[PDB]
Design a protein around this ligand. Sequence first.
Ligand SMILES: *C(=N)N1CC(F)(F)Oc2ccc(-c3ncnc4[nH]cc(CCOC)c34)cc21
Length: 281
Amino acid sequence: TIFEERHLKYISQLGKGNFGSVELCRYDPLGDNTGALVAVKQLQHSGPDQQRDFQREIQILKALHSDFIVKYRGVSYGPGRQSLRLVMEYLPSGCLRDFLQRHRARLDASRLLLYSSQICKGMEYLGSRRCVHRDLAARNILVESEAHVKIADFGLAKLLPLDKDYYVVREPGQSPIFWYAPESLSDNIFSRQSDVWSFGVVLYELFTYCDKSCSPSAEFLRMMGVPALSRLLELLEEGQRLPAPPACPAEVHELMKLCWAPSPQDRPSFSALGPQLDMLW
Ligand SMILES: *C(=N)N1CC(F)(F)Oc2ccc(-c3ncnc4[nH]cc(CCOC)c34)cc21
């Protein structure tokens, strides 16, 4: 629950992003290099709202207990009472994005659908706890094992007040626009309904095995052509969508098309999506 910085022997960097970073540390009090491995998140440079946003990320993940959400192990303190580091479980297989590229000859559509089912189930749970992820993408999903995935990175995640079912953000979204729904693009509105849209892009990502050539960014920019955001909005408002991934089963592509309904209230819920994905196995 509380990790001492003196017993957290740093190994490598696991990745960087959103004013902070994740480090592969070893929690070994004995100082012998024989202890458990943990994923440790800090901010590379602290800020005003940055420290508050990180503090909220910790609260959110502390309160999330699902087989499809990366486990919170605790915190490591410095000043009183600023929670300097966030300690999570270490999933050696890392990102689904990189795992997909590395193992695509081994992973069939059955396995891709299992992943989808698990990502969906975890999003069902988030929605149940009034949590908008706001940054669902294959880069933000982790691999526990060959048949197990968990949703990670809650750095942009928000909690819906009980009176409101949508959330309007002020600061522009510094994440690739290719995952945002039109209402996020145009009016900075985020919901479980926008997370569903971003899930369709995750299904796209899965069935393209995160190929860089037909990636959401690569393929939309190719379709585009004015500011880039405006060009994307025009495209999607005309009803233009990402093409069917090569060799993708039609039923899956149809589910992507569904997640990509222009209006948020026409998109299926994760509760509704889940058994549909289970039908495909
Ligand atoms: C995936 N290969 N990466 C690269 C990246 F996206 F830049 O950043 C990452 C940070 C951390 C991990 C990660 N790897 C292993 N165990 C983990 N537990 C929690 C996290 C955080 C996920 O942050 C996106 C990890 C992977 C990547």
